[PDB]
């Protein structure tokens, strides 16, 4: 994903 290092990608 795009949310810095909080959900799987």
Same mark, same amino acid.
């Given at each position: 994903?795009?949310?810095? =290092? =909080? =959900?799987?990608?």
């Amino acid at each position: 994903x795009a949310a810095x =290092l =909080l =959900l799987p990608x």
